Design a protein around this ligand. Structure first.
Ligand SMILES: N[C@@H](Cc1ccccc1)C(=O)O
Ligand SMILES: [Ca+2]
Ligand SMILES: [Zn+2]
Ligand SMILES: [Zn+2]
Length: 274
């Protein structure tokens, strides 16, 4: 797999930050900053060669959207998916929650085209709407995917909050093959990981039997003395002191965590697709 350029990931975050500022300060469901975020991401994918779909739904009397991007080619009976919710709460720009995951997934999709990659399994990426309303967008996708298509899914990988300022490195403990793939990449960096325990878009896929996995750097919980010894940072302070706040801005990101988790995402996607 290729190394994902950290500066490219940060540049997508800067574009989302400007979008929030030009649309009343947020990127929330039912507000213009969310559809403006969808338009930015979709334009990059269309230019790279992806076949995109805008999936519309209604929640709370307002129109919502999920963006689906399919890379032409691959075995139609074995599909590998990766995703991230693209909405924020209405209090701020939601840069770590969840511009971080949205940006790592987009840059991985652009890296596939730049490398001229032809995976054995068909690749499909997704950016979810209305996750903050209770996983509304991802539930709409699973509820409307015919069972013949559900059986063709080899796995779903989720990235929701991967750039926390006082980070922990958590790996979901779900499907064994997916978990081992993420854990092995971190072992190669000599960075220890812990099981994710501290409610995201992988839930509706997991509940219908699709194998799932993912990465997380922590939210409102407090980092312990032992976690600070293995990862650095500040014991006694939250992993993210700006969770769901107006301060979840461009300054609310730890560059090392964003870089490692973006690189790990690309490693897992290459490994599990060929
Ligand atoms: N899904 C939560 C954050 C979270 C991510 C991953 C695991 C648990 C929680 C949110 O949108 O705030
Ligand atoms: Ca990198
Ligand atoms: Zn989130
Ligand atoms: Zn959230």
């Amino acid at each position: 797999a290729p190394d994902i350029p950290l500066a490219n990931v940060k540049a997508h975050l800067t574009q989302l930050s400007t979008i929030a500022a030009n649309n009343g300060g947020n990127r929330a469901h039912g507000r213009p900053g969310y559809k403006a975020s969808v338009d930015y991401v979709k334009a990059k994918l269309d230019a790279a060669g992806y076949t995109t779909t805008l999936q519309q739904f209604t929640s709370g009397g307002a129109t919502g959207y999920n963006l689906i991007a399919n890379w032409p080619g691959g075995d139609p009976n074995k599909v590998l998916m990766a995703g991230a919710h693209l909405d924020s709460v209405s209090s701020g720009a939601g840069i770590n929650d969840n511009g971080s995951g949205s940006a790592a997934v987009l840059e991985t999709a652009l890296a596939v085209s730049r490398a001229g990659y032809q995976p054995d399994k068909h690749l499909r990426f997704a950016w979810w709407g209305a996750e903050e309303l209770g996983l509304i967008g991802s539930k709409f996708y699973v509820n409307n995917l015919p069972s013949a298509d559900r059986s063709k899914l080899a796995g779903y990988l989720n990235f929701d909050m991967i750039g926390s300022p006082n980070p922990g490195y958590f790996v979901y403990d779900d499907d064994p093959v997916i978990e081992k793939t993420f854990k092995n990449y971190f072992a190669g960096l000599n960075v220890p990981t812990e099981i994710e325990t501290e409610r995201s878009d992988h839930a509706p896929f997991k509940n219908v039997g699709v194998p799932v996995g993912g990465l997380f750097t922590g939210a409102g919980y407090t980092k312990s003395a032992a976690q600070a010894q293995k990862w650095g940072g500040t014991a006694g302070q939250a992993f993210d002191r700006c969770y769901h706040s107006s301060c979840d801005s461009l300054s609310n990101i730890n560059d090392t965590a964003l870089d490692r988790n973006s690189d790990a995402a690309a490693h897992a996607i290459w490994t599990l697709s060929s």
